[PDB]
């Protein structure tokens, strides 16, 4: 396998590259590790905004190098007030099978990547996911994001342990964004999002009314 | 170590399944399949009730137009032959690009979660009447995609 150390990868508009790590995980067979990066909509783009080379490059086991994701000049053309989406994708692809008559099988791991113009550059401290907004509705809740960054919600429950386990679709909002998830009604809702870093944090709400924020 | 859920085991990390068929014997009449292969995907640093929350499970390939939801094979028989992959459900055909129904056939062993897919070779149904499928090999490939949230 070829390991992506994290579940996401933030890229920061401030710097012109940044490099991303990956390697062989398996300890017999070479791989053939495809890297590329998709758009919002999953397309493949190897045109741009942004770049990962190489777009190629042979792996022997248990071996590690890099990727490095890099912008090209049109990248300008991205809003610079909020994030933009991307996808990072890591295909190993193995010796082809000398054996007839055979499935094969490659591993592909996708992942989020978040462009961060420089201009809403996050201190390493920072929680804007504090900012989201909750508004009872019939049948669940309206989950607004305020903020400039997509944020992924994992889980919607009365106690930091019902946000945890309770039985929820994952969901992600774009910036300045809002959508409604189906829902129990939660005296206190607490919800759980994936941060920059894979943390899985769990946030407490406090209602005023139908409309609740964080305490 | 704990750290990057539910990545592929490695193990689990060379997967292939052979098909041992003959022609005539197997796609000139019903039901024109092979047995069931079954290959199965160990995912570390996985649980159960977070599987759906952390990561989907979608096989990406070359669909064959003459049977939706299976993968398209190579050589002298494409066209003719198709690849069905089976859910961890066991019966579920997962047709390519869409992702792994949650629940159902999952295996929680230990720190980590299995997955018992199956794949079989299929007749197309023309392919099938017309009896044109010939002695000779195929191949087929499959992209097993982990998509984190």
């Keep these: ?215 | 170590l704990l750290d990057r859920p539910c990545h592929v085991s490695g193990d689990s990390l060379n997967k292939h399944v052979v098909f041992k068929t003959r022609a005539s014997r197997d796609f000139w009449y019903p039901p024109g399949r092979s047995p069931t292969e079954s290959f199965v995907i160990r995912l570390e640093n996985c649980h159960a009730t977070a599987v759906g929350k952390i990561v989907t499970l979608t096989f990406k390939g070359t669909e064959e137009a003459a049977l939706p939801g299976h993968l398209k094979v190579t050589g002298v028989n494409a066209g003719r032959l198709g690849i069905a992959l089976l859910d961890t459900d066991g019966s579920s055909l997962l047709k390519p690009g869409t992702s792994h129904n949650k629940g159902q056939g999952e295996k929680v062993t230990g720190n980590s979660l299995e997955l018992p897919f199956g794949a079989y070779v299929v007749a197309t149904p023309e392919a099938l009447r017309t009896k044109s499928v010939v002695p000779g090999d195929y191949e087929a490939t499959a992209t097993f995609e982990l998509t984190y949230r």
């Design chain 1, 1 to 215: 396998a070829v390991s992506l150390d994290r579940t996401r990868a933030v890229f920061d508009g401030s710097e012109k590259s940044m490099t991303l790590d990956i390697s062989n995980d398996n300890k017999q067979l070479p791989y053939l590790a495809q890297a590329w990066i998709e758009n919002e909509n999953q397309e493949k783009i190897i045109t741009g905004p942004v770049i990962a080379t190489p777009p190629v490059q042979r792996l022997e086991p248990g071996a590690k190098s890099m990727v490095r994701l890099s912008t090209t000049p049109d990248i300008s053309k991205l809003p610079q007030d909020r994030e933009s989406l991307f996808y990072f994708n890591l295909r190993e692809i193995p010796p082809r099978s000398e054996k007839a008559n055979v499935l094969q099988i490659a591993l592909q791991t996708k992942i989020k990547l978040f462009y961060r113009p420089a201009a809403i550059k996050t201190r390493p401290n920072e929680v804007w996911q504090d900012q989201l907004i909750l508004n009872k509705v019939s049948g669940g809740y309206r989950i607004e994001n305020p903020t400039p960054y997509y944020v992924t919600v994992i889980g919607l429950g009365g106690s930091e342990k019902q946000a945890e386990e309770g039985e929820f679709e994952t969901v992600m909002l774009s910036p300045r964004s809002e959508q409604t998830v189906k829902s129990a009604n939660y005296n206190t809702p607490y919800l759980s999002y994936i941060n920059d870093y894979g943390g899985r944090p769990v946030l407490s709400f406090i209602c005023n009314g139908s409309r609740c924020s964080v305490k």
